[PDB]
Structure formats: C-alpha cells, structure tokens
Structure 1
Amino acid sequence: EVQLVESGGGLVQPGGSLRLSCAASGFTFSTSWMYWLRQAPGKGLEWVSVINTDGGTYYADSVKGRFTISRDNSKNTLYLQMNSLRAEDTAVYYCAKDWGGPEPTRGQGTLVTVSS
C-alpha cells in the first residue's frame, strides 16, 4: 500500500511559522507529482501547492511568498514551509500523490490552527 504520513502541524500565533513534512512510501516517489491540499473546517478540499518531478512548483494565490513546497527525493519527503501564518490558514493539511491522476492518494492530515 501507499502510505503518506504528515506531521508538523500545531497551534501557532498569526505571523508565526511551521514546517510540515510528509513521509511517503509504497510508490515510486521520484516520478510522482506531489501536492499539499488543505481542508478548512466547514469547507471542502482545496489545493495549496504542487511540485512536479523536476522540482518546478505551483501555488494557490493566497500562499505565494508565504508557503514553499519542496521535495527531498532521497528521503521520500515532501515539505511545506509555512511562513507568516494567518488565521485564515487554519485547516487540516494533507499530502497527496498525483492528485490530478494517475492513482491519486491522500495522507492522514496534520492540523494547523492559527490563533491569537
């Protein structure tokens, strides 16, 4: 089976930072496009960030200049560096493999709560 295991979330003040990680196994990580998604409570899933197999990246508008996606292929890890956090960023964050196909898979999630 594929496993995607996220961690690094927490409760943080606005303006703070977190670094999420996802540990991947059970598929060929280095040939997959990798994603961060989020689900704010009360809402559905939305995409946050995407990294292709050559390290090129795409971002949702509201996170540009704040969040950075990166991949460490040697260690099967996807990262989300989250700087300058906002209350509106409160959500469960999910790692996902090949969300636009083929064989999409989502992780278990890590909660980020941004509050003063």
Structure 2
Amino acid sequence: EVQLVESGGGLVQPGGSLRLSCAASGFTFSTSWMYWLRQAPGKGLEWVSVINTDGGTYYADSVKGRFTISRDNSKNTLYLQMNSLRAEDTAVYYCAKDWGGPEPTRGQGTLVTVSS
C-alpha cells in the first residue's frame, strides 16, 4: 500500500513560518507528481503547490512568494516551506501523490493554525 505521513504543522502567529514534511512509501516516488493540498474549515479541498518529476514547480496565486515546495527523492520526502503566514492560511494540510487520475492518494494531514 501507499503511505503518506505529514508532520510539522502547529499553532503560529501571523508573519511566522512553518516547514511541513511528507514521508512517502509503497510507490515509486521519483516518477510521481507530488502535491500539497489544504482544507480550511467550512470549505472543501484546494491545491496549494505541486512539483513534477524534474523539479519544476507550480503554486496557487495566494501562496506565491510565501510558500515553497521541494522534493528529496533519495529520502522519499516532500517539503512545504511556509513563510509569512496569514490567518487565512489556517487549514489542515495534506500531501498527495498523483492527485489527478487514476489512483490518487492523500496522506493523513497535519493541522496548521495561524492566530494572534
């Protein structure tokens, strides 16, 4: 089976920073597209950042210049560096593999709450 185990979330003040990590197993990491998703309470899922197999990256507009996605293939890890956090960033964040067809999978999530 595929396993995706996120951690690194926490409660932090606005303007602060966090680093999320995602431990992957049970599939061929280096040939997968990798995603960060988030779910703000009251809302559905939205994509935040993705990285393809050559290290090229894409971001949602609202996180540009704030969040950075990266991958460490040798250690089967996905990272999300989150700088200059906003209250509106409060959400559960999920790592994901191959979220577009056929067999998308999501991890268990790590909560990030930004509050003064």
- List per-residue Cα deviations over 1:5-58 (Å, max 9, x = no partner): 000000000000000000000000000000000000110000000000000000
Q: Where does residue 5 of structure 2 map in the other structure?
A: 5
Q: How does 1:27-106 map to 2 (within 5 A)?
A: 27-106=27-106
Following superposition, the deviation at residue 93 of structure 1 comes to 0.2
Indicate the percent of aligned positions where both proteins have the same amino acid: 100
Between the aligned partners of 1:98 and 1:28, the Cα distance in structure 2 is 11
Aligned residues: 116
* Normalised TM-score (structure 2): 0.99
Counterpart position of 1:114: 114
CA distance in 1, matches of 2:101, 2:30: 15
Q: Displacement, 1:61?
A: 0.2
Q: Name the CA distance, whole Å, in 2 between partners of 1:54 and 1:95.
A: 18
Deviations 1:63-104 (A, max 9, x none): 000000000000000000000000000000000000012311
**2: distance between equivalents of 1:74 and 1:31?**
12
> Which has the larger displacement, 53-62 or 98-107?
98-107
What is the TM-score of this pair, normalised by structure 1?
0.99
